[PDB]
Amino acid sequence: DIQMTQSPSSLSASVGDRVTITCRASHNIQNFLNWYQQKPGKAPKLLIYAASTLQSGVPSRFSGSGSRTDFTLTISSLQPEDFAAYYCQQSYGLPRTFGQGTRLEIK
Amino acid sequence: QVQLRESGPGLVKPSQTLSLTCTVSGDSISNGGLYWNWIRQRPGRGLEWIGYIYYNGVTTYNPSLRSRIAISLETAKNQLSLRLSSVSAADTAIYYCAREGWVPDYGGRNYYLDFWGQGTLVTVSS
Amino acid sequence: VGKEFSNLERRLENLNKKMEDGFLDVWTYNAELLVLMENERTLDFHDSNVK
Amino acid sequence: GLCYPGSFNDYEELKHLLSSVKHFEKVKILPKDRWTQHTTTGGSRACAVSGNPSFFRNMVWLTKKGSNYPVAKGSYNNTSGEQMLIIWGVHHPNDETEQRTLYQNVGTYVSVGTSTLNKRSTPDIATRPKVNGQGGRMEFSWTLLDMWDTI
Amino acid sequence: LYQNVGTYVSVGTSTLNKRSTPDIATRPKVNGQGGRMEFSWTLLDMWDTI
Numbered sequence: 001d002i003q004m005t006q007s008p009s010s011l012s013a014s015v016g017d018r019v020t021i022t023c024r025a026s027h028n029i030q031n032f033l034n035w036y037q038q039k040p041g042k043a044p045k046l047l048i049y050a051a052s053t054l055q056s057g058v059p060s061r062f063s064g065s066g067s068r069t070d071f072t073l074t075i076s077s078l079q080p081e082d083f084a085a086y087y088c089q090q091s092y093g094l095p096r097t098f099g100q101g102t103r104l105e106i107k
Numbered sequence: 108q109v110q111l112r113e114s115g116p117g118l119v120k121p122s123q124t125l126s127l128t129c130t131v132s133g134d135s136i137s138n139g140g141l142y143w144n145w146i147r148q149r150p151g152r153g154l155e156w157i158g159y160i161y162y163n164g165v166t167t168y169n170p171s172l173r174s175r176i177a178i179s180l181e182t183a184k185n186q187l188s189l190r191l192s193s194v195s196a197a198d199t200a201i202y203y204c205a206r207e208g209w210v211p212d213y214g215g216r217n218y219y220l221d222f223w224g225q226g227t228l229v230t231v232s233s
Numbered sequence: 234v235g236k237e238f239s240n241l242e243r244r245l246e247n248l249n250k251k252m253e254d255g256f257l258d259v260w261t262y263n264a265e266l267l268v269l270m271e272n273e274r275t276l277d278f279h280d281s282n283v284k
Numbered sequence: 285g286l287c288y289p290g291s292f293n294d295y296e297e298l299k300h301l302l303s304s305v306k307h308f309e310k311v312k313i314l315p316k317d318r319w320t321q322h323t324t325t326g327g328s329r330a331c332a333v334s335g336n337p338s339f340f341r342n343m344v345w346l347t348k349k350g351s352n353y354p355v356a357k358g359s360y361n362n363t364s365g366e367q368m369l370i371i372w373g374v375h376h377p378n379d380e381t382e383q384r385t386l387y388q389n390v391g392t393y394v395s396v397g398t399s400t401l402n403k404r405s406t407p408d409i410a411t412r413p414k415v416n417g418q419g420g421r422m423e424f425s426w427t428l429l430d431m432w433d434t435i
Numbered sequence: 436l437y438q439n440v441g442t443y444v445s446v447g448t449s450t451l452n453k454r455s456t457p458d459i460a461t462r463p464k465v466n467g468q469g470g471r472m473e474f475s476w477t478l479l480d481m482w483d484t485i
């Protein structure tokens with residue numbers, strides 16, 4: 001169905017740095033992109049839903065935006081705790097799909 | 108408040124049937140009007156969506172599993188279950204159940220997964 | 234309600250979408266505002282009637 | 285704007301597209317040095333700089349070399365990593381005389397396409413009022429070449 | 436009507452640039468005629484030449 005391409009495959013950034021991770025959809029997914037944070041040993045946590053809305057309890061350092069076919073996850077003021085794989089989820093159609101997962105390492 | 112818990116056999120032999128059960132707690136499975144999902148992670152690989160069931164029996168699946176998968180729920184126990192036939196090495200994964208919520212939006216309900224269970228590992232081996 | 238546009242009609246597709254989203258905002262606003270204004274008056278109405 | 289009198293098709297549509305663009309990476313796709321069969325050094329007084337006839341900096345006005353105009357061909361497979369904007373155009377001389385001294389061939393055409401684009405245009409050779417000193421017109425068109433597609 | 440068959444009509448201004456050719460073909464009769472006439476228009480600006 002609609003495939004998701006996530007890039008970079010991995011990031012490395014220092015504490016206090018700002019980084020971005022992007023999602024590219026093969027089709028128009030009209031503001032139906034969700035972002036998830038997966039820490040080792042845990043089920044993925046929802047960070048951002050409907051392209052730019054933060055889930056309750058998500059730190060203010062996380063934000064994002066986008067439009068048809070292109071979305072960005074921005075993480076400012078990276079802390080040692082923000083170590084995770086980040087995933088792109090496309091909720092637009094029924095056979096829901098995910099991107100590959102970006103691995104972000106904190107220094 | 109909402110928690111999802113999972114259990115299963117742990118070990119499945121090749122060509123046997125894999126069967127997992129998710130128990131929903133703090134969220135009536137039959138009243139919320141929400142969709143219940145199964146997702147898994149194979150070693151190395153990222154998240155793969157398996158399928159979902161509505162609060163009623165309407166069920167959808169990832170087409171790659173169309174010859175092998177069945178999903179059902181028992182309202183009486185607030186439980187979801189996943190069944191995969193002809194299980195092989197490729198099916199080793201951490202399985203997770205999750206709840207699908209929504210935001211009313213300009214394009215229709217905008218769905219997301221807020222509550223996830225802890226998941227469980229199923230190993231397929233001889 | 235739904236319409237389809239070609240890839241060379243982005244200006245029109247956006248006009249159409251803006252129109253539909255615009256009316257949705259107007260009606261969502263009117264529906265929510267009317268419910269809130271009326272609930273305030275309904276409760277005042279009932280307290281007034283008991284008095 | 286256009287130093288050489290002309291028109292730009294779907295110009296309003298391109299300006300709309302740019303409302304969704306924050307940055308372009310300009311990529312050389314068809315280095316002008318590849319057109320070994322054509323003159324790539326033409327221009328006009330209308331675009332002249334300090335008295336020297338010139339032309340638009342990101343485009344190649346292909347004209348006759350020696351005594352002929354071999355069919356001009358080229359393509360790009362868009363391996364740049366993202367969807368690319370490509371602009372090209374058609375010259376419209378104001379007289380057969382101009383068409384002949386620039387191209388030799390008169391019954392010419394320009395054909396462009398992709399997996400979704402299919403266009404063929406011919407020049408309109410005719411007298412028109414002068415604009416910026418020229419009785420000629422140049423018509424520009426554009427397309428978005430998708431990823432891994434070939435123009 | 437015209438002697439020439441491979442004809443064209445060319446019209447232009449500082450902003451208008453059009454060339455049309457006739458379409459010679461059988462069509463249903465309308466008002467007794469199997470022919471059609473196509474009209475176009477432009478606004479000629481001040482001091483411009485058509």
Ligand SMILES: *[C@@H]1O[C@H](CO)[C@@H](O[C@@H]2O[C@H](CO)[C@@H](O)[C@H](O)[C@H]2NC(C)=O)[C@H](O)[C@H]1NC(C)=O
Nearest residue numbers: 359360361362363364365399431432433434435
């Ligand atoms: C344009 O470049 C792409 C990338 O190299 C070529 O597509 C690849 O073709 C091979 C087979 O020869 C496949 O195994 C790859 O999976 C393809 N890659 C991608 C990203 O699709 C493509 O063939 C090239 N172009 C043309 C016009 O023939």
